Amino acid sequence: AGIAAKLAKDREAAEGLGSHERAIKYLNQDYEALRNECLEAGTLFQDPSFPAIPSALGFKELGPYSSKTRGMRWKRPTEICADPQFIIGGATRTDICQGALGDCWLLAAIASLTLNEEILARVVPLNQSFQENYAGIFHFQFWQYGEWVEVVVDDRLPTKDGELLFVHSAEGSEFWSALLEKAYAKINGCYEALSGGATTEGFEDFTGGIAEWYELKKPPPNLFKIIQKALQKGSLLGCSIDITSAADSEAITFQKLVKGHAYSVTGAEEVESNGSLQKLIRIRNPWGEVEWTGRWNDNCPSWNTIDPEERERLTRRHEDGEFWMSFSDFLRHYSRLEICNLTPDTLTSDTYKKWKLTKMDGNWRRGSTAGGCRNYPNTFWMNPQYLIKLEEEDEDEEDGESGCTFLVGLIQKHRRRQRKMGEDMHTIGFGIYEVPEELSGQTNIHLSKNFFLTNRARERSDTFINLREVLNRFKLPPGEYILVPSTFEPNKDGDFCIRVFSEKKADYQAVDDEIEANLEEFDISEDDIDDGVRRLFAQLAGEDAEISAFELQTILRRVLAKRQDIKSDGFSIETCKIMVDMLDSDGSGKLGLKEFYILWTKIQKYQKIYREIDVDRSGTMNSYEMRKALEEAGFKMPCQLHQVIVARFADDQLIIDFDNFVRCLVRLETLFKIFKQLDPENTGTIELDLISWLCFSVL
Amino acid sequence: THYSNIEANESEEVRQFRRLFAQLAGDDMEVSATELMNILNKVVTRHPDLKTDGFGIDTCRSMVAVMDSDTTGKLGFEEFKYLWNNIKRWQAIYKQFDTDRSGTICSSELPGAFEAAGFHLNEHLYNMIIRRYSDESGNMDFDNFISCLVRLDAMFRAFKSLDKDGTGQIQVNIQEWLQLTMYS
């Protein structure tokens, strides 16, 4: 609560929290601590953050009044099977299946983790058993919007009649997929929070990678190469078949099933068949059973038809899920998604190429950074901004000019409104424009309206979809670009993470304004003010020239606002107490005459600035017009700071009147001089004891 | 779907707050500075034994900002319970030092109160809180009293958060400095 918490957390992240190595600990639970504790008291873990109650299953649909979750007992593996194995060796096939209450998509993502030992060990720590130090607690790592969170769970599983209701191995004595699922259910809040979920969602949540999906009845004319660069990049490619209104036909020499069964693409090679050149795609059934006439159709015995054993011996080598159908496969298989793993995914094994990664993080806030689409140029230029830099382009021989490929994924974080996954999603997109030159805005300037106004995009966002992550694989020539992430319509609060997978290095910065402050150099005096304020002011001061903050108020109200209260007339006392603190360099609480004319003048330089913006004797300023009002006021700031100003002085109608605009500028000018003075050597930081912090923290 | 978050150990007050929260935000269960204001200016204003005119907008804003971690300008539901607990608590101490109901507390009477509210400030902090919060005379009404104490306690928590190792000291760049001081 409060930024000292988030700043503190931002420091930790910067030091390494949220990283696979230092996964964030969900609900402050400590797997070792909790296990150790139970290890000691000779007992079993009963998770206090995820009771074996109905609320874990759901909210009356898989909830507490409903039959589905009635009379079912939470049994641990201890009771379920004889030799409860968590996991087992190499494990050829995969016999994982849903229960009468699980979800189809679930088995797809979970099963996809069995394709790689290295990539499963990342979500599910292998250092776990029911033999040595059981205690009944397991842990898992889930990637949550750019970060890893470690989750703890007790092995209690929902069973009705005595069988697992959710995911489980049909044969075995293994229960890591059962508990991997309960764990993912817990971090989503409800087991029923998993419904509505998408395997692309689980892939990334179980990977850290970026899953790009493609509709197969209208794929890219470069999908084969796409499939090839991924396969040699250890990417987890997954294709599926659609079930459209009882769709279960053959369609061509293609069998007879049109079942929505998830398959994987482990191979893709282009081969010369009698001089024709056949692009083949090797599919693999994650569960094993083959069932596909031919071996590779099209007059099938094409493994002898001008295809030497010098490549025939390569094919049909493996075991389990052995297909190899022609790319013309497009007949069947309605879909394909590949999780393009991140750099560290592979235990540095030189085995597969690696993607280059550079994720960021941002916010959209109403009245400041919630810019909106390129559709709304008034506010658009107010969304956070970034810099993509491309220099080294791709490698293959020749294919469609350009060079540098970058897969951009923009993802939106959760916000107490999405009861499930897939719901209450903001419509998100992003726009790419190329840096026309700017060495100034190279990273230390925030592009205004004018730039996106005189600048077209290029390929940018293809449409603002309404889902968790919006993708966009590009390939623009070696240069410098600006990504502007946003929703469609303005004023839609939300957090996000914008990552980048490029086949080659790519300098990605966060283009925004530095915290700058530069205005008056009000060198004091007594003379030259011209005996003007001198006369009538000294008259207002009881004796010498001192005027307290409570005096400043009544005095300043006689001047401005003409005296009719409504829409804050004059200056609130907090404002006045602020206007005093900004000039009272002793602690008198009253203002002299020099450090009074200062206030009088700097204030005059605020009315002009407020009305030069608010063209209308309404005494009301909009929010978005602050970045620019603080501009002609001497101060600049990064997006965070603009966000707090609006979140502190703006109305619910996103309005900041003159009074709050003045305390804001005075409160703000004061802290700059405090830090700047505490930091003469310009080290960039200041030291302070609690007392010091207290003297200062109270304005 | 229908509002969840069930404790079974509800309370009278709170749940009416909770019902108000949903009637204005619902599943969001978040309130703004003005919405909050209204929500506090009833369970604090309705008592014929507490002399106050309610919380000022700036007070609620400080109430919203200090409990708001993402800078969305909205007070959470759970963050409200922390605060209101503290409020229903400082109201208590307030009337102890204002037992002659006047809508404020005697100047040199305030120290006992701060020493009582669980805050024993040093020379200057007391000076800081008076300058900043004492009204004209140098007295203090319930509004500043609560606000001061909300902002005070939160600046203890803030420090302790940025001082994990425990050096009784803290270093901040200008970004942080400004966020900490502008969002309070």
Swiss-Prot record, chain A:
Residues 529-699 are annotated as: Domain IV. The active site is at C104, H261, N285. Ca(2+) 2 binds at Q228, K229. Activated by 200-1000 micromolar concentrations of calcium and inhibited by calpastatin. Residues 44-343 form the Calpain catalytic domain. Residues 344-513 are annotated as: Domain III. Residues 1-18 form a propeptide. One of its GO terms (molecular function) is calcium-dependent cysteine-type endopeptidase activity. Its cofactor is Ca(2+). Residues 514-528 are annotated as: Linker. Ca(2+) 1 binds at D657, N660. This is Calpain-2 catalytic subunit. It comes from Homo sapiens (Human).
Curated annotation (Swiss-Prot), chain B:
Its main location: cytoplasm. GO terms for biological process: positive regulation of cell population proliferation; proteolysis; regulation of macroautophagy. Ca(2+) 3 binds at D98, D100, S102, T104, E109. Ca(2+) 4 binds at D53, D141. Ca(2+) 2 binds at D68, D70, T72, K74, E79. One of its GO terms (cellular component) is cytosol. Residues 7-41, 55-88, 85-120, 121-149, 150-184 form the EF-hand domain. The keyword Metal-binding applies. Signal peptide: none annotated. The modification N6-acetyllysine is found at K95. It comes from the Eukaryota. Keywords: Acetylation, Calcium, Cell membrane, Cytoplasm, Membrane, Metal-binding, Phosphoprotein, Repeat. It is found in: Cytoplasm; Cell membrane. GO terms for molecular function: calcium ion binding; calcium-dependent cysteine-type endopeptidase activity. Ca(2+) 1 binds at A25, D28, E30, E35. The keyword Repeat applies. It is linked to Pulmonary hypertension, primary, 6: A form of primary pulmonary hypertension, a disease defined by plexiform lesions of proliferating endothelial cells in pulmonary arterioles. The lesions lead to elevated pulmonary arterial pression, right ventricular failure, and death. Primary pulmonary hypertension exhibits incomplete penetrance, sex bias and variable age of onset, both within and between families. PPH6 is an autosomal recessive form. Regulatory subunit of the calcium-regulated non-lysosomal thiol-protease which catalyzes limited proteolysis of substrates involved in cytoskeletal remodeling and signal transduction. Essential for embryonic development. Homodimer or heterodimer of a large (catalytic) and a small (regulatory) subunit. In presence of calcium, the heterodimer dissociates. The contact of the 5th EF-hand domain from each monomer allows the formation of the homodimer and also appears to mediate the contact between the large catalytic subunit and small regulatory subunit for the formation of the heterodimer. This is Calpain small subunit 1. It comes from Homo sapiens (Human). The gene is CAPNS1.
